[PDB]
Subunit: 60 residues, 2 copies
Amino acid sequence: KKEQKLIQAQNLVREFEKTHTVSAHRKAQKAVNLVSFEYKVKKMVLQERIDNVLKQGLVR
Amino acid sequence: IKKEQKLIQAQNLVREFEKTHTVSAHRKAQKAVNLVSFEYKVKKMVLQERIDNVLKQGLVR
């Protein structure tokens, strides 16, 4: 399901915002990449959320 | 030797990461550091700290 992929991406982006880990970054970006391009705006916001955590700083 | 080349590569890549702060540079640097031999433990500790310090400042894509 395409909706399932979107939900997984939402959850993993949330986790990345909580922890800022390198591992969480990769899981979140992977999940976002796997969402269908048809969810244009939803994906853009998820991507921007990832980008914002990246610039805040990361930990291993 | 191979180990000596791996050390210099890690040093170069950490320096590049300090300059650019990119996700790509982070990965290249961390992989290279991980490949450094335990005989260079202190240099590895220093390189790892340098990576950690860039990471906490924030990265660009």
